[PDB]
Design a protein around this nucleic acid. Structure first.
Ligand SMILES: [K+]
Ligand SMILES: [K+]
Ligand SMILES: [K+]
Ligand SMILES: [K+]
Ligand SMILES: [K+]
Ligand SMILES: [K+]
Ligand SMILES: [K+]
Ligand SMILES: [K+]
Ligand SMILES: [K+]
Ligand SMILES: [K+]
Ligand SMILES: [K+]
Ligand SMILES: [K+]
Ligand SMILES: [K+]
Ligand SMILES: [Mg+2]
Ligand SMILES: [Mg+2]
Length: 1304
RNA sequence: AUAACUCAAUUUGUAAAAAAGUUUUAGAGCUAGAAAUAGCAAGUUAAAAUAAGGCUAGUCCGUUAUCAACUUGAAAAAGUG
DNA sequence: CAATCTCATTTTTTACAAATTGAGTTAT
DNA sequence: AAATGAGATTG
């Protein structure tokens, strides 16, 4: 009888029901409720609208930040608990004054001065220590016994803000000249014939200067005569500067040697480069690393370490002193030269002067930006110098302090404890505890320290003690926890679901991969009559000789080093591999480098051991735990080898277990899978073959909720929301249809700036390019496609090997690498900037061989810098493979209309498995319902071909129309070409033919291209399509004025309110930040979020007399009030002032609750206090199509013939608005503007008319520009009128309703 | 369509950390002058909170997902035109 | 009242698993 | 990232 169309989207699911002849039925549905209507007629087309499903990310960031706060608090509490007994003797209330510091004097138990509890001592303190860093320095340097409260405050300050953990081990700050002299000296021992002269260069001043790395490099090698920044020494300095140099051209290497000191891979990149150039060069590179460390410290410390043990605190004190001197000076200067402007600068808090800087909301950047012109227009020079150094007037608590390692704060903490433990015994006894408070960190592989109540926690306990930083190693089981961390995410082997998958870098796994590949190699020589498999002997030979010697095995090496040497073939042809083997024994060679014993690796009796070792290296990344894991193998290798094995670390897991590979045996053979891969006789059988082979027993040994299911698919939670919604829609429609299932179901599914600036900064830096200095950019500017490409191509044409001009981009071209006709790709992977696309070569193909020849090296540079990806590069270069084959072309064309996306396949599988539940007499599935999946293009092209057009901004009907067209087209296709079921339906020379076929597949809808009016299916002679009437039905359907558009009603969740903390002020609006913090005193939160609104019919007290007055009103229940409201709603409402609440008239009203007022006017609930537009403007099709054609030959003369349609459209919009919108000022502005601009071209007026439909669009009001006239939105900020209106509760389809007239 | 492998890009989910920001309070303002109001001196730091909070009391949990109405369920979801 | 204008926490690092897409080798 | 609910001031 019927089929179902579905259009799945992130914010929408369109749906339609169609009959044999592609009509959409209309049915009468019962209405419920207290109203006049008992029924309504509904068309079976419609669409469901919903807010986007959100990722878990924000929730995650919040949760983890929460944990950070409570653990930081616990740190302080540990400290205070160590100080408690001895502080009670010094100061009874000290810690109490601290914890009540936030309270106003009125609420304080103790005196208002936190530290010493009296004004004179407090003032004295601040006068002696204007910043906490003064106290830090003096407490690190001094020998004097110190007041215990100041000791506490300094330790607490270092523990509360402890700096980061990104550097392992400890630092003992270093005092760059000596390390530079060092670099020069080892370099000079390595090159005896050309020395470099230390010369009396100042290495400290030049390398620690505030400039960029490249400029310090250039300055440094300026002082070096005849040395070039690209020479070896220059590259070593650059390396030490954190940069990424390339040492290949120093050493005559054909392979890029590039060392970035940050990347974890360094020691291995050094290991291989060193491996080529000799190991007499290791001294040099370690030297460069030392100089890197000291140069990195020189950013923060900025002070000679001879004066103090507290270089950080000392450099903060330095910031303070120069702030003071420069401020005295600046004030003087403004007095003299610009006294008028003194006020604004040092007083007005709103101006971003020094007053806005200290007392206001102006940042360092905004302050600098404000006074730049005030400095350079005076006579001041050095203050500007400090401003470009960003050193000018610096606070000590700053955005850039995130560089500070915790090791320096630890240095100061340890110094203080050593100083004052002499005077205070408990500091000696507890010194280590305290250091460990600062030092200890929960390992990421442990996770939350939980007892049973955390859904997020995997960690296991070695003992039941409460965990502390001091007992952590003893109480927490770290090996088990670290193991669960990975194993709870890792795949089991699907063939042996109870078996863990092997490490990707496991030796056995790599033998399996190499042999699996090798087994299908075939060879022919002159004599032999056919290509033959390798035998077991030949494979073992190739493995021992090539795979166990060379890290990668090329086809050339297979030919020369095996077939020539061993088998004496001067020529051979290899059929199973291309240019080199994909599989390799990498771990074999890694271990060979480390353990230096090949007999050990080749000996079967060590297999287990080696497996275990690699498992450890894979399963743990913590070097201490790795060591403890390898102790048992301590005896087997020299302590140095254990030192190197320690550092070897791998990541990743395979697809297969060890039992599957080498464990199971075939009953007849007794051979494992790998035994067969090694020797199978004549047949050389694949893993796939072994697994599916009925003569072998491997196969039989192997053969041994909707919402969760959807949540488990891989895909954006956004699209998943629409997937679940789509299933619920189908359920409801099947119910609507009498519990009869559809004949078909046709589903179609819809398809920064900081990341960009990052890509370009890194790629450019790699490339060594100046284009950033020469042409500075800002993140937002990179939203421009042409400019982003410009910076990714390094200012160069991508095809022509010439420079491009930044001012000239408007004259340049963005070209598609593989043409858009074949591949619809809008991304930067398929796009390129060139001055003219004509220089790509032929239009029909990949860029020409000429262009590949000329540009391939440059594209290689870009690839290495990662300014282009691999995919881009391989597509760009494909012409040297023959470019696009005709078969490739046909592939693209059919991929345009046939849906390959895995997520959509999952949708079809869900629907197919819910619809088809029965099996036939052979125990095979009965498909009563065919699930068809189409790509958007089909309905798009159809729409364009037959002039059923689409303008999204008129209303939401187009989602539902799209679903209808999906059902019509999708049913027509399979009706016409039933064989294409295999492509389009879920479940189980010639290239040119395929190309023409899938390119023309849709022509059976057309009369002439010449085809008959009536199309049929040749085999059954059934009528699929009749050009005379069927199209007419399509038009009638699109025209239908009543389409069910349902905005899903949803309880709002998430944040309680906006996060900002406003200053104290008298408003009942401010929300307390803590139970007892009265916002009138303390400030608080504004703008809570309504979870849902409740209808209340009750009485409220009135006036001094408290006369009870009956009310009906709408009360927003905030997310924060929700649980309290639901626990006991009556007590909650009574605490709000409502009395004699009528409990059964309470109506829950989530966001977007729908109401109908007079004249069919509708409203949706935005909140308790605001409304959204609830009506759709159904614009007759003739106007939709006219608008489409006008805003974009015969169609032009239609437009010019129908120009009066503009006035008619304005009259539709205005009629609609006067009945429904009820914004009079804005409507008059619209009419005024439209009547202004009618001298404009008809295209322009069409486009901007299309702008006008946001006035009439459903949902939240929004602003729109007509031409240059902006129309500000009109919000509906009263809900009063709803309380007497008719509320409409709707089904998911909107076909079932219950309507409540609210009078009560 | 599936499986293993190579290379790469993307997405989702989790954990452990850092720097700021804000908010109240504390950093004795000074002279005039009744009064506001002037004149000048000043400023860089800290404590504490950072979803209200919860019981399960953990160095845990608290912003994702899921939700018409009615009858039924504690929930999923079931039953209703 | 409504018309108008304004506001909205930000950023950084480390470690890890899984799909998925898409260019390739081999198989069911 | 906007966009959209609502805070703040003005007509
Ligand atoms: K008091
Ligand atoms: K030089
Ligand atoms: K401020
Ligand atoms: K500021
Ligand atoms: K601050
Ligand atoms: K290959
Ligand atoms: K590892
Ligand atoms: K040993
Ligand atoms: K939600
Ligand atoms: K939301
Ligand atoms: K990630
Ligand atoms: K609903
Ligand atoms: K908002
Ligand atoms: Mg808290
Ligand atoms: Mg602060």
């Amino acid at each position: 009888k019927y089929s179902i169309g579905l259009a799945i989207g992130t914010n929408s699911v369109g749906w339609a029901v169609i009959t044999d002849e592609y009509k959409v039925p209309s049915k009468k549905f019962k209405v419920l409720g207290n109203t006049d209507r008992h029924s309504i007629k509904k068309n079976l087309i419609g669409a469901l609208l919903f807010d986007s499903g959100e990722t878990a990310e924000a929730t995650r960031l919040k949760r983890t930040a929460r944990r950070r706060y409570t653990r930081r608090k616990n740190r302080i509490c540990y400290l205070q608990e160590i100080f408690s007994n001895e502080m009670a003797k010094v100061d009874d209330s000290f810690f109490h004054r601290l914890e009540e510091s936030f309270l106003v004097e009125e609420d304080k138990k103790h005196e208002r001065h936190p530290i010493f509890g009296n004004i004179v001592d407090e003032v004295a303190y601040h006068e002696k220590y204007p910043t906490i860093y003064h106290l830090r320095k003096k407490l690190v340097d001094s020998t004097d016994k110190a007041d215990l409260r100041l000791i506490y405050l300094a330790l607490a300050h270092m523990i509360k803000f402890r700096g980061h953990f990104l550097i392992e081990g400890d630092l003992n700050p270093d005092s760059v000249d000596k390390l530079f002299i060092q670099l020069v000296q080892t370099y000079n021992q390595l090159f005896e014939e050309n020395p470099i002269n230390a010369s009396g260069v100042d290495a400290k001043a030049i390398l620690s200067a505030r400039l960029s790395k490249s400029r310090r490099l250039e300055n440094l090698i300026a002082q070096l005569p005849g040395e070039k920044k690209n020479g070896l020494f220059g590259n070593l300095i650059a390396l030490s500067l954190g940069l990424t140099p390339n040492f290949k051209s120093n050493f005559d290497l054909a392979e890029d040697a590039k060392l970035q000191l940050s990347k974890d891979t360094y020691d291995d990149d050094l290991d291989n480069l060193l491996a080529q150039i000799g190991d007499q060069y290791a001294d040099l590179f370690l030297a460069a690393k030392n100089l890197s460390d000291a140069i990195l410290l020189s950013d923060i410390l900025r002070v000679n370490t001879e004066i103090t043990k507290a270089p950080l605190s000392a450099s903060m004190i330095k910031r303070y002193d120069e702030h003071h001197q420069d401020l005295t000076l600046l004030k003087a200067l403004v007095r003299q030269q610009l006294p008028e402007k003194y006020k604004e600068i040092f007083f007005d808090q709103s101006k971003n002067g020094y007053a806005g800087y200290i007392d206001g909301g102006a940042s360092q950047e905004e302050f600098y930006k404000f006074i730049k012109p005030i400095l350079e227009k005076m006579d001041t020079e050095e203050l500007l110098v400090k401003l470009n150094r960003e050193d000018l007037l610096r606070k000590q608590r700053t955005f850039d302090n995130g560089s500070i390692p915790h090791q320096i704060h630890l240095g100061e903490l340890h110094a203080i404890l050593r100083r004052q433990e002499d005077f205070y015994p408990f500091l000696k006894d507890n010194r280590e505890k305290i250091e460990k408070i600062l030092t200890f960190r929960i390992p990421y592989y442990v996770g939350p320290l939980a007892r049973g109540n955390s859904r997020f926690a995997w960690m296991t306990r070695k003992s039941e003690e409460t965990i502390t930083p001091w007992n952590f190693e003893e109480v927490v089981d770290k090996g088990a926890s670290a193991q669960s961390f990975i194993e709870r995410m890792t795949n089991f082997d699907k063939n042996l679901p109870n078996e863990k998958v092997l490490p990707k870098h496991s030796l056995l796994y790599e033998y399996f991969t190499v042999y699996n590949e090798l087994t299908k190699v075939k060879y022919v020589t002159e004599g032999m009559r056919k290509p033959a498999f390798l035998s077991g002997e030949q494979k073992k030979a190739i493995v021992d000789l090539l795979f166990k010697t060379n890290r990668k095995v090329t086809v050339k090496q297979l030919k020369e080093d095996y077939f020539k040497k061993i088998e004496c073939f001067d020529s051979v042809e290899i059929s199973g591999v291309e240019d080199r083997f994909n599989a390799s024994l990498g771990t074999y060679h890694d271990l060979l480098k480390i353990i230096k014993d090949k007999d050990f690796l080749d000996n079967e009796e060590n297999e287990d051991i080696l497996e275990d070792i690699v498992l450890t290296l894979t399963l743990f990344e913590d070097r201490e735990m790795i060591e403890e894991r390898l102790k048992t193998y301590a005896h087997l290798f020299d302590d140095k080898v254990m030192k190197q094995l320690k550092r070897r670390r791998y990541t990743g897991w395979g697809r297969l277990s060890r039992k599957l590979i080498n464990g199971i045996r075939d009953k007849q053979s007794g051979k494992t899978i790998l035994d067969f891969l090694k020797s199978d006789g004549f047949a050389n059988r694949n893993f796939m073959q072994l697994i599916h082979d009925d003569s072998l027993t491997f196969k039989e040994d192997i053969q041994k909720s909707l919402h969760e299911h959807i949540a488990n698919l891989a895909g954006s939670p956004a699209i998943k929301k629409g997937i679940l919604q789509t299933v619920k829609v189908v359920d409801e429609l099947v119910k609507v249809m009498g519990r009869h299932k559809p004949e078909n179901i046709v589903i179609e599914m819809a398809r920064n700036s900081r990341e960009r600036m990052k890509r370009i900064e890194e790629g450019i830096k790699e490339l060594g390019s100046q284009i950033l200095k020469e042409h500075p950019v800002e993140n937002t500017q990179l939203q421009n496609e042409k400019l982003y490409l410009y910076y990714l191509q390094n200012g160069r044409d991508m095809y022509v090997d010439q420079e491009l001009d930044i001012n000239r981009l408007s004259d340049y071209d963005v070209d598609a690498i593989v043409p858009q006709s074949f591949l619809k790709d809008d991304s930067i992977d398929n796009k390129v900037l060139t001055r003219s696309d004509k220089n790509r070569g032929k239009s029909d193909n990949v860029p020409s061989e000429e262009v590949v020849k000329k540009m391939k090296n440059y594209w290689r540079q870009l690839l290495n810098a990662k300014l282009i990806t691999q995919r881009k590069f391989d597509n760009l270069t494909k012409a040297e493979r023959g470019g696009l084959s005709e078969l490739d072309k046909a592939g693209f064309i059919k991929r345009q209309l046939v849906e390959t996306r895995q997520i959509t396949k999952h949708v079809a599988q869900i629907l197919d498995s819910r619809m088809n539940t029965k099996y036939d007499e052979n125990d095979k599935l009965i498909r009563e319902v065919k699930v068809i999946t189409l790509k958007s293009k089909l309905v798009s092209d159809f729409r364009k071909d037959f002039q059923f057009y689409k303008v999204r901004e008129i209303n939401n009907y187009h989602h539902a129309h799209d679903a209808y067209l999906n059902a019509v087209v999708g049913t027509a296709l399979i009706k016409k070409y039933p064989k294409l079921e295999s492509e389009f339906v879920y479940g189980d020379g010639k290239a040119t033919a395929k190309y023409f076929f899938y390119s023309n597949i849709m022509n059976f809808f057309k009369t002439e291209i010449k085809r008959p009016l009536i199309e049929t299916n040749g085999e059954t002679g059934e009528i699929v399509w009749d050009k005379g009437r069927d199209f007419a039905t399509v038009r009638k359907v699109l025209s239908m004025p009543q389409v069910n558009i349902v905005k899903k009603t949803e309880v709002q969740t998430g944040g309680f309110s906006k996060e900002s903390i406003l200053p104290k002020r008298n408003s009942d609006k401010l929300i307390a930040r803590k139970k007892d913090w009265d916002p009138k005193k303390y400030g608080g939160f504004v703008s809570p979020t309504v979870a849902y609104s409740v209808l209340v019919v009750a009485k409220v007290e009135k006036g001094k007399s408290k006369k009870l007055k009956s009310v009906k009103e709408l009360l927003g229940i905030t997310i924060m009030e929700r649980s309290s409201f639901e626990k006991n709603p009556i007590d909650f409402l009574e605490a709000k002032g409502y009395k004699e609440v009528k409990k059964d008239l309470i109506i829950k009203l989530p966001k977007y609750s729908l109401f109908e007022l007079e004249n069919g006017r509708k409203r949706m609930l935005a909140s308790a206090g605001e409304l959204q537009k609830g009506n759709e403007l159904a614009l007759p099709s003739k106007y939709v199509n006219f608008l489409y054609l006008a805003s974009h030959e015969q169609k032009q003369l239609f437009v010019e013939q129908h120009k009066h349609y503009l006035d008619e459209i304005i009259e539709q919009i205005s009629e609609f608005s006067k009945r429904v919108i009820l914004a009079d000022a804005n409507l008059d502005k619209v009419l005024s503007a439209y009547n202004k601009h009618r001298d404009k071209p008809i295209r322009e007026q069409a486009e901007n008319i299309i702008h006008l439909f946001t006035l009439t669009n459903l949902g939240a009001p929004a602003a729109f520009k007509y031409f240059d006239t902006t129309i500000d939105r009109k919000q509906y900020r009263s809900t009063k009128e709803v309380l007497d209106a008719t509320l409409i509760h709707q089904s998911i389809t909107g076909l079932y309703e219950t309507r409540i007239d609210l009078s009560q």
